């Protein structure tokens, strides 16, 4: 039951409870061993636990396909510290170390509990006998494919080697297959399900985007005669949500260009909101001062390009304003998501302009054509363009903002609770959109 899992969670990995109820359900679904499983959770212990913990209770060997030795090494080392009988198979292993491991796996009841392996070996003719004998002797408990997204040309990290993993699944019929990734759109999910030949019904555990404490809205720069004024009001409202502490928290303004960053910081400062520009144009000494001053709460507002380093995060960010629409929905989600980590209410505003859209739309097309000359045509290029369109749709359409973000990532409808402009006043947004339409000339 639940009992066996909970003990071995503390007994071996030393945790009281699973981080989330989702991480628990996933782990349990892998334990039952009746269904192929797909885990999409942000990088961390939670994800790895979903195959590692079950690997031990299995009473057989779990094979884990991972794309490169670096990632394999991190894990074998961490598993070894927990006194776990883990091994790796790759070319970088010595001829003698190799012969020893192969001998261990040919042995009735081997010591290897978890075997990490690269996609080339997992599919190479030289390894199939070993795989077959393990199968014959019912010693194969699970096949795990980490970095599952790598199978997809529509993903960011396409690896041809991952296309061979499909044929392997059927051979390991007896054993359930677990596919894990941090990052998959609906389209990348489909490629994983198909290319790895997962057996239906596939159980899906996918950490949702939604955060109840973030109020999202879009403002149309085309309808606003005082832009710098509108931003000042927005900044001051978001700060001083604790009237007796006065001005509490900090904020980020994101801009595409360095000129825009310098200019906006000045326009905010001159209206009584202390802001400093942060961009790649500044020297390292300047960048450290600006970051320190913002992290230490000396200057409450930082105006930055995409360049803003996340060396450490900040829990009290009360607002994230995008002066310019981002390259991609993933970019916007990640940048806007730097707000409200503490759990307290926060504001995410996108200042949208058809002029900004056209300019960014055009720049993406140019940087794609530049990479097409260097590395050739790819399906990933069209994912880059679709990634922007989801954000253009976010700005120019009526509907919950949290829903539009959920749709792009492949989450279910989230529980918005008047947590975006549309859900708090549909007609207001309709009126604003109608007005943008009249301005279209």
């Amino acid at each position, epitope marked *: 039951p639940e009992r066996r899992v909970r003990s071995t969670l503390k007994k071996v990995f030393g945790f009281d409870s699973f981080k989330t109820p989702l991480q628990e359900s996933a782990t349990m679904a892998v334990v039952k061993g009746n269904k192929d499983v797909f885990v999409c959770m942000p990088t961390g212990a939670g994800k790895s636990l979903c195959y590692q913990l079950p690997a031990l209770l299995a009473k057989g060997i779990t094979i884990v396909v991972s794309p490169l030795i670096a990632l394999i090494q991190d894990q074998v080392d961490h598993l070894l510290t927990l006194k776990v009988r883990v091994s790796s198979l790759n070319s970088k292993l010595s001829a003698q170390e190799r012969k020893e491991l192969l001998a261990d796996l040919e042995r009735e009841k081997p010591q290897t509990k978890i075997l990490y392996i690269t996609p080339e070996m997992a599919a190479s003719s030289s390894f199939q006998p070993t795989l077959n004998s393990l199968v014959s002797r019912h010693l194969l408990s699970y096949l795990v494919v980490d970095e599952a997204h790598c199978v997809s040309q529509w993903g960011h990290d396409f690896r041809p080697d991952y296309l061979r993993l499909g044929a392997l699944r059927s051979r390991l019929g007896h054993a359930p297959c677990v596919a894990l990734t941090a990052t998959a759109t609906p389209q990348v999910q*489909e490629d994983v399900f198909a290319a790895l030949h*997962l057996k239906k019904p596939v*159980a899906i555990f996918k950490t949702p985007c939604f955060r109840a404490n973030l109020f999202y809205d879009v403002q149309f720069k085309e309808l606003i005669s005082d832009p710098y004024g509108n931003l000042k009001d927005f900044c001051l409202k978001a700060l001083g949500q604790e009237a007796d502490k006065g001005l509490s928290g900090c904020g980020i303004v994101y801009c595409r260009t360095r000129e825009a960053c310098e200019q906006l910081a000045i326009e905010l400062s001159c209206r009584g909101v202390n802001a400093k520009a942060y961009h790649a144009g500044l020297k390292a000494s300047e960048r450290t001062l600006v970051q320190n001053d913002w992290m230490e709460e000396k200057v409450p507002v930082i105006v930055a390009t995409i360049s803003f380093g996340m060396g450490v995060d900040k829990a009290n960010v009360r607002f994230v304003a995008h002066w310019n629409i981002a390259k991609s929905m993933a970019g916007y989600y990640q940048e806007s998501g730097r707000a409200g980590r503490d759990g307290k209410p926060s504001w995410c505003r996108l200042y949208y302009s058809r002029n900004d859209r056209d300019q960014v739309s055009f720049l993406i097309r140019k940087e794609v054509a530049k990479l097409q000359e260097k590395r050739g045509n790819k399906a990933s290029d069209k994912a880059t363009i679709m990634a922007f369109d989801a954000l253009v749709t976010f700005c120019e359409e009526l509907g919950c903002r949290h829903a539009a973000i959920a749709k792009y990532f492949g989450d279910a409808l989230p529980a918005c609770a008047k947590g975006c402009d549309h859900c708090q006043n549909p007609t207001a947004v309709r009126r604003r959109l109608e007005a943008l339409e009249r301005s279209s000339s």
Partner: nanobody
Amino acid sequence: QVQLQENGGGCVQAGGSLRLSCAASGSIFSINRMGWYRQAPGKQRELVAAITSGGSTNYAYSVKGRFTISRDNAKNTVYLQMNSLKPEDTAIYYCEAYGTYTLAPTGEGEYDDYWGQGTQVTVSA
């Protein structure tokens, strides 16, 4: 989970028309492909027609130019316009929701194929 409601079956004169429909209900994010299969009495189930989300269509040769599959992606509904029906079209018609992605706000979900119960089509000579 997913329920498939099929409709539009019946008895018609050869040369007549029907429209089969199949609405899928549940916590459905998407369906890769919606399709019509048919099984005539004591004969193997065959593909009549299928349409991806995308609108790529696929017809059995014996119905090309007579039958038209179409899909409302937002209502998870597929349609089969059947014209110039022939006796040989007599069968139980099944809908397939291939690659159905279901998901709750918790993040638990499924990817599965689902089938309807079947709807009788009979064509009298």
